[PDB]
Amino acid sequence: KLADCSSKSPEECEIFLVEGDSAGGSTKSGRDSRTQAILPLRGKILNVEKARLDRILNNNEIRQMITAFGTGIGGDFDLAKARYHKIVIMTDADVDGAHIRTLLLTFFYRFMRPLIEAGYVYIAQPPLYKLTQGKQKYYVYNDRELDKLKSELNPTPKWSIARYKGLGEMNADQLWETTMNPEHRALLQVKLEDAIEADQTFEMLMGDVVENRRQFIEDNAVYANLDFAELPQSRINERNITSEMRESFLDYAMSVIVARALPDVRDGLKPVHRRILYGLNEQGMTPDKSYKKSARIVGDVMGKYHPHGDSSIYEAMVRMAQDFSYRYPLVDGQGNFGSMDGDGAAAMRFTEARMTKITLELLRDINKDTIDFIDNYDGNEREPSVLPARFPNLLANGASGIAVGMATNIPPHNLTELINGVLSLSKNPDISIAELMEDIEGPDFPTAGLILGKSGIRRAYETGRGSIQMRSRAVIEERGGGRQRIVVTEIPFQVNKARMIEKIAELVRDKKIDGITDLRDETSLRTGVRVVIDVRKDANASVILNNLYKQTPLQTSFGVNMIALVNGRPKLINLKEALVHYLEHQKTVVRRRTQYNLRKAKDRAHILEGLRIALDHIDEIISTIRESDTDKVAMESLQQRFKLSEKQAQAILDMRLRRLTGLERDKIEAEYNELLNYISELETILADEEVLLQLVRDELTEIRDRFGDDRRTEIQLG
Amino acid sequence: GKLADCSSKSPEECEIFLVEGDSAGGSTKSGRDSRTQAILPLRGKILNVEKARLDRILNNNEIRQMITAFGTGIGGDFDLAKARYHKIVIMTDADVDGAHIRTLLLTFFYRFMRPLIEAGYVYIAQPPLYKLTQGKQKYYVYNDRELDKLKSELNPTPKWSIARYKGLGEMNADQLWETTMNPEHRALLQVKLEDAIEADQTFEMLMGDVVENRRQFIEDNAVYANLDFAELPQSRINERNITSEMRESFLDYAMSVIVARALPDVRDGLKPVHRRILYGLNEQGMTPDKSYKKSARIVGDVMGKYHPHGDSSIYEAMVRMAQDFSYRYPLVDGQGNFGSMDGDGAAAMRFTEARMTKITLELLRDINKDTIDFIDNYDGNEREPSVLPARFPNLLANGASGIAVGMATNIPPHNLTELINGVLSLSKNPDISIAELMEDIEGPDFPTAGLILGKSGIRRAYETGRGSIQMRSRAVIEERGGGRQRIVVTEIPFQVNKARMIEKIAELVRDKKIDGITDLRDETSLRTGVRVVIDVRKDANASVILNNLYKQTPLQTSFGVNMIALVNGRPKLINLKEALVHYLEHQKTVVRRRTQYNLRKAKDRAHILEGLRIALDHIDEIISTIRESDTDKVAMESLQQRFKLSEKQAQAILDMRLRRLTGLERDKIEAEYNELLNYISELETILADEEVLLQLVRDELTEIRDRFGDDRRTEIQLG
DNA sequence: GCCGTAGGGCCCTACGGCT
DNA sequence: GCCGTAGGGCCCTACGGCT
Ligand SMILES: COc1ccc2ncc(C#N)c(CCN3CCC(NCc4cc5c(cn4)OCS5)CC3)c2c1
C-alpha cells in the first residue's frame, strides 16, 4: 500500500504518515515525486501500551511502518539502515486527528525509541479552517482559536469560513502551500526531554489504569473559558514529547466529553441525537407528512449540522427509532430497522423515517426565543445548544456511552412516574429521596421483564451508583403425556436473544448443564417474544431454570453510573439533582416563552394603535399621501402632522385596500381588546414567580395524560 | 452457512426463500414463520452461468452456497431425494434488477438443477413495487407501466398517497409477510417447463454470448409508447411458464437499462443519472456563486428525490462530471481529492464538497419559463425534468461512454467553438453536407489533448456513426549528455491509466520482450504539468523504440466510435449531421416556447396594469366605493358593474398597498406600460416569422460561443 | 466479550465492443 | 481484461465498566 519517491538517499528523503487512502489522495498529488513518500494507514491504530506482544506484531499497519523505516525494533533496531531521515505525522487537524498522533507517538516510543531521540520523528500541522474577509485569509488550527478570532474582527465585511474534516477535503495545492512546501512549513521536531518523565506520562494516558487518567482530566480541564490561549509558544519549531502528548490527548478527551459521549441534563441527548431531531424539525419532516428517505436526512444532517462519517449518524438515528431500545421512540420508522438478534437495520439507501408525535414536544416552543443557538461547524447555519425538552428525556429514555476516564449508564423510566415525580418536587423543594420513590418506583424498560429488589435500585437513586439485577419473564408450562418445557416471553434490556441461545446450546454440547432435549426460538411477529426450552422426562425444570439464571445471561446486571452534563461539566448526580436541573430548565423555558409572547403583543398593539387613527381621520390621510411624492418623504408627512412613529407609518402605507371595509374597523377593536387581556395575563406572570411555575405544572400534567403510559417492568419485592 | 434455517427438518413442508442481500433478508427473518420458512441471502447479481466456463461456477461463492442448502449435488450426480426443502422460492426485490437477478437464478436452476424445476419445486414470490392509497382503498402494483394505467383510471378527488419500495428493506416486516409470504393470502407462482427445446432456445439466446441475437430480440418485442397495451386473462391459476419468465423479465429490464440508464438523450447529451444530479444542484441554489456543499448533502438529496439507486454510482458519476481529464467541459466544481489519472478515486461523500460550473447554468437556463417537459419522479411526490434546455450541444461537447444491454454507445468529446460554428452552418442551410460540416468540426477534441493519425477514421465515424481512430501520446526526444538521450511524454491517449500504462511498459522490459531501455521514471507533479520519462541506452535508436512502444502498449491506443443515442424515445445509431439537427431542433423549440411563455405572462401583467390605470386616474371614486362596501364578496361585484374590471382586476385592486398613491408611482406604471405594449410586439414577431426566431437562436448560440469558446487541445496529424 | 459514538477502507457480480 | 451504471456487503481500531 506504500507509495514511495524516486530518490534513494536517506538524507533528503522523508515520509508523511496519513490517516487514509482518501486523505492520502491530496497527499500524493501535492507532493514532490522525487523526495517525499506517503504511507496510507487505516483510522485509529492499535494503542500499543494496552495490547500484548504477540498481537502488536500481527497488526498489519504496525508492520507496514516497520518495513517502511527498515530498522526492526526493540533491540534489533538499527538507525543506520533507515530509509528516511524524516518521519512526518500528518493527521487530519480535527480532534480525532490528535488522538491518532498520540498513538503513533506512543508506538514510536516503546519500540522505535532511539529514533525519536536522534530527531528523525516529526509532526505536521495542517489547518482546520480558513476564515476569509476580502483579501485577508486566516488559518486557525482548532475550534478554540476560532472562538477568539471570530470575535476580534470588529470590521465584519462578512466571512466565508471553510473547514477541513479530512485531507481529502483540501485541494491538493492548499496542502502543499500550507503543509508540505519545505519553504513555508511549520514542521515540528519531536525531541525527548527527561526520559523518566515520559514513562510516567505514557503510563498515565496510554496505560490501563483508568483512574489516574480521570484525575488528570479534572486537574487540567478548561470548560467555558476564552481567556485561555496564553501565550508565547516560543517561535521555534520543536516540541517536547511530553509537552505535546499531555496536551493533544486532553484536547481530545475534553471534546469526547463536552460534546460526544455524554448527555445534557435537560434534553438528555448526546450531540449527534440533538442535531438529528433538530435537522428533522428544520427540513419539516414531521409525523403528519410522509416518510422521507434515510440518506436524505443523514446526508442533510451531515452537511448542515454535524461533521462526522455516516456510519455514526445513521446507526444512531436508528436506535432512536427502535421500540426495543428507546422506551419512548423519538423517530417513527418505515423499514428494516433491525432486531434484538444483533442484526442491524438495512442500509441508509432503503429505509425511510420521520418524527414521532412525542419528539414534537421536545421541540415545542424552540423557534420562540427560549433556548440559545450557536453557529454550526462553518458559520453558514444556525443550530441549537439544547432543546426545550418538555419532558425529562434524560431519565424518560436514558442514555449510555463510553468516554475517556469515565463512562455513563442511565436506565429509562416510566413517564407518568417521572412527571408525578417532578410535580411533587415543584410543590416541595426540600423533598427526600425516599419520598419521591412513592411516585417513581424505578427503572421502567422497553423490553419489559423483571427486576429483583429495591436493594440495588435504592442504592442507585440515592448515590448514582448501584447494581440492578435483571431477570427475564419465564413460564414453566407443560404439554401433556409426561413432559415439561420452558417459555421465555420477555427479556433483559440490552440482551442479544440469538447470542444468548448460543451460550445456552453451548453449555449443552459441553454437558455443563443437564436435562435439556432441544433448544428453539419460536419468536415471530404475531406471537411476540417466545423462546422454548424442551426439557427431559420429569427431571425438575425448576433447578435447570434456576441454573440458567446463573450460568447464562437470562439474568444480568445493569451497572448504573449516572454521569450527565451539568452547565458544561461532567458531574455524577442522583435522582433528585436530575429533576432539580430539568425543572430549572422548564422554569427558564416557560419564562422566556413569555418574555417573547410579550414583546410581540406589545409591538402589535403598537401597530394597531396607528391603525385605529388612520381609520377615523381617513380622508385627511389620503390627501396627505397623494400630495407627497417619494417614499422617503411620505414617512415625514404623517410623523409630523399626525404624531405617529416610524413602525406606525410604514405599516399604514403597507396596508391594503380590503382592510378599508366597514367590517374590519369593528373587528380591530375586538382583536385589540383580546390583546389588552392577553398582555394582562403576562405582566402578572413576570411579577408573579408563582403563577408561572403554576403554568409549568399545568403543561406537564397535559404531557403526562396525552403520552403517559403503563408500567412494563414488574418489580419483584424481596 | 450465512443461512437462517427453520425449525422443522421435514422437507415436504419446509420452504427456503432466496433474497438479494442481507438488508432485505432481515425484513424477512422478521416477517417469517421461523417454524417452516428458511432464508438464504445472496449478495447482489450472481454470475450468468451460460457465459461461464464450468470450473468457475464451481468456485463462485454464492453458488456453492445454494448447492449446500438444497443439498442435492449437480448435473451428473444430482440426487433429488436428498433435498431439504420442497419449495425453493425465488424472492428478489420488486424492481427491474430483481428482474435481471431473477433470470440469472432460473438460468442456473435450468442448467445444472434441471431435475429440481421439473417436479414443481421452484417457485417465484411476488413482492409489490408500489402502494397507492385513495383514502380507504390500498392498491398494489408491480411495475411502472401498471402504475400509469392506474393513475389514469381513478377519479383523483381523493389525491394519491403513492409509496415506492426500492427493495424489501423499505418494507415493514408485517406488510411483507402479508403481501408476499403468507400461505393463506400469498400468491406464489410454480415454475413449469413446456417445450424443452424452446427453453434451450431462449437460454442460449438471452443468457448467451451472441450479442446480435439478443439485440434483434429487443428490436422485435420493442414497445416504447406504450399506449395501453394488452391485458387478460392471466389464467386465474398460480402457475407460470419458465420460457415466458425469461422473455418478459429480461426484456422488461434491458428496456429500462436502454431508455433510462446507460444511454444519453440526444437533445441534452445526458444519461438520466447526470440530468438528475445537475437538476438537484439547481434545486438547492448550488450555483457557482454560493459556496461548496458537502457531497453527502447533494448525493443524499438527489437520491431521496430523483434517483432511487445506490450512492456508490450517484457519487462516482457526480465525480466523473467534475474532473478535468474526462469531461472536456466540466459541469461540476471540485473542492477536494476528486481523483487522478492513475486510477485512484475520490474520497467518500463526507470529505468532498461541490457546486455547478458556470457552463452548467447554460444547460439549466430557462428551465423555469416552461420550455421543457416536467414528469413525476419515482414516488410521485415531486416534479423532475424529462430533459434540459441544453443551450450548448452537450452530447457532442462532452460525449458519453456507457454500456446498455444488447447494444453499446461511444461518443468522443468535441471542441465547442467548432460545434456551434457547425451548428450555425446548419441553420443557414438545412441541406449542408457531411464534408461541409467537417470544415468547422475538424474532429474529436480531448481533455488530454494529444495527437490523432489521419481523418480516414474520423471520417467513417462522422458519416455513418461507426469508425476507428488512432490516438498518439505526445512524445518528444531529447539529450541529457554526453551523447546519450531520453524520451519525454507530455500528453497521453485519452482514457488510460497512466500508472498501469507505465507498469505495462516496465513488464516488457523485466521479461526481455523489447530492447533498448535502461531506466523508467514517473516524474509527473502538480506544479510542472504531466511528464513521464524513458532513458535511452546511448547509441541505440530512439525512433525505433518509440515506434516499437506504440504497437506493444497503450502508448498508441484507439477510440472506436459508436454514436448511439436516445432519439424521440428510442435507440438510434446516428451520424454527425443527425446529431446536430435534432439538437438544433430542440434548441428551436426550447426558444419557441420560452417566447410563448414570456408573452402569456406579458399579457397577464398587461391586463393587470390596465386595471391599475382605471384605478389610479379614477382614484377618488374608489374611496367612496370601498368605504361603503361591507363584505369582501360585495366589494368585488361592485367595481365589476361600475368600472368594467375583470375578476383578476377588481382583485389586484383590493390587493393594493396605499404607498403607491404617492406622486411618482403613477409614472412608474405608464412608463413601463408602454415599454410593455412594445415588448409584447417583439415576441409575436418572433412567433409569427419562422426566420425571425431562428435568427434569434443563432445569436444566442453565438453569445455562448464567445463566453465559453476556447482553443483546441488535440492536434490532428495529417495522413 | 460486549455496549455506543467516533477514525478508516475492498470485493464479488451483469453488460458490449475492443486489443 | 478494461471502459461506467447498476445489484449486493464486512472488517480493523480506541474508549470504560463489568462477567
Ligand atoms: C459493506 O461491506 C463492506 C465490505 C468491505 C468494504 N471494504 C472497504 C470499504 C470501504 N471504504 C467498505 C465500505 C462500504 N460502505 C461504507 C459506508 C458507505 N456509506 C454509504 C453512504 C450513503 C450516503 C452518504 C455517505 N455514505 O452520504 C449521503 S447518503 C457505503 C460503502 C466495505 C464495506
Question: By what method was this entry solved?
Answer: X-ray
Phi, then psi, of B482 in degrees rounded to 5: -110, 115
Q: Which of B61, B295, B298, B299 to mutate to test the pocket of ligand 1 (most atoms within 8 A of CB)?
A: B299
Fold of the domain spanning A464-561: Gyrase A; domain 2 (3.30.1360)
Question: Could you tell me the three cell numbers for B179?
Answer: 403481501
Instruction: Please name every residue paired with B190 in a beta bridge, in sequence order, or none if there are none.
Output: B123, B239
CATH number for the segment(s) B599-687? 1.10.268.10
With CA atoms as reference, report the closest residue to B169 among A344, A322, A336, A292: A336
Tell me how far CA of residue A662 lies from CA of A412, A674, A690, B632, B678, in angstroms: 59, 20, 43, 10, 41
Environment class of A640 (CB within 10 Å of its CB; exposed 0-12, middle 13-18, buried 19+): exposed
Q: Is the peptide bond before B42 cis (omega within 30 degrees of 0)?
A: no
* A:373-402 residues touching chain B, CB 8 A cutoff: 380
E strands, B159-282, in order: 189-192, 239-241
Q: Give the CATH architecture of domain A257-463+562-597+687-718.
A: Alpha-Beta Complex (3.90)
Those residues whose C-beta lies under 8 Å from the C-beta of residue B367, and which sit 6 or more positions away, are B282, B385, B388, B389
Residues in chain B preceding a C-to-N separation beyond 2.5 angstroms (breaks)? none
Nearest nucleotide (C1') to alpha carbon of A214: D16
Distance CA B398, CA B362 (A): 14
Fold of the domain spanning B1-241: Rossmann fold (3.40.50)
Q: Which CATH superfamily is domain B258-464+563-598+688-719 in?
A: Topoisomerase II, domain 5 (3.90.199.10)
User: What is the residue extent of each domain of chain A?
Assistant: 1-240, 257-463+562-597+687-718, 464-561, 598-686
Question: Could you tell me the three cell numbers for A151?
Answer: 470575535
Distance CA B333, CA A124 (A): 29
**For cell 530518490, what's the residue?**
A7
Residue closest via CA to ligand 1's atom 27 equals B296
Instruction: Tell me B179's DSSP state.
Output: I
Tell me how far CA of residue A569 lies from CA of A217, A224, A366, A563, in angstroms: 11, 9, 24, 10
With CA atoms as reference, report the closest residue to A355 among A280, A257, A454: A280
User: Would an 8 Å CB–CB cutoff place A298 in contact with chain B?
Assistant: yes
User: Would an 8 Å CB–CB cutoff place B172 in contact with chain A?
Assistant: yes
CATH number for the segment(s) B465-562? 3.30.1360.40
**For cell 441475437, what's the residue?**
B213
The Cα angle at residue B417 between residues B281 and B411, in degrees rounded to 5: 65
Distance CA B421, CA B434 (A): 14
Neighbours of B222 (CB within 10 A): 13
CATH number for the segment(s) A598-686? 1.10.268.10
Around ligand 1, the residues with Cβ closer than 6 Å are A 295, 298-299, 310-311, 348; B 296, 299-300, 311, 349
Helical (H) or strand (E) element with B536: strand B532-536
Neighbours of A203 (CB within 10 A): 14
Max Cα distance, chain A (Å):
108
Residue closest via CA to ligand 1's atom 10 equals B348
Q: Are strands A188-191 and A238-240 parallel, antiparallel or unpaired?
A: parallel
Neighbours of A117 (CB within 10 A): 16
The answer to whether the CB of A414 falls within 8 A of the CB of A444 is yes
Using DSSP's 3-state secondary structure scheme, residue B95 falls into coil
Q: Are strands B37-41 and B15-19 parallel, antiparallel or unpaired?
A: parallel
**Which residue in B35, B173, B655 is closest to A522 by CB distance?**
B35
Catalytic residues of A: 19, 92, 94, 96
Phi, then psi, of A438 in degrees rounded to 5: -85, -35
Strands across the sheet containing A188-191: A122-123, A188-191, A238-240
With CA atoms as reference, report the closest residue to B527 among A183, A559, A349: A183
Q: Give the CATH architecture of domain A1-240.
A: 3-Layer(aba) Sandwich (3.40)
The Cα angle at residue A274 between residues A273 and A275, in degrees rounded to 5: 90
Which conformational region is residue A268 in: left (phi greater than 0), alpha (psi within -120 to 50 degrees), or beta?
left
The experimental resolution of this structure, in angstroms, equals 3.5
Residue of A nearest to B528 (CA): A32
The helix-helix angle for A618-627 and A575-616 (nearest 10°) equals 80
Report the separation in Å between the CA atom of A162 and the middle of ligand 1, taken as the mean of its atom positions: 25
* A:320-349 residues touching chain B, CB 8 A cutoff: 334-336, 338-339, 341, 343, 346-349
Those residues whose C-beta lies under 8 Å from the C-beta of residue B643, and which sit 6 or more positions away, are B614, B618
Question: Could you tell me the three cell numbers for B377?
Answer: 419522479
The answer to whether the CB of B258 falls within 8 A of the CB of B217 is no
E strands, A145-304, in order: 188-191, 238-240, 292-293
Q: Rounded to a whole number, what is the distance in Å from the CA of B503 to chain A's nearest CA?
A: 14
Report the separation in Å between the CA atom of A467 and the middle of ligand 1, taken as the mean of its atom positions: 39
Tell me how far CA of residue B607 lies from CA of A368, B160, B196, B639, B682, in angstroms: 43, 36, 74, 15, 18
Distance CA B201, CA A621 (A): 91
Answer whether B291 sits within 8 Å of A160, measured CB to CB: yes
With CA atoms as reference, report the closest residue to B22 among B177, B168, B186: B168
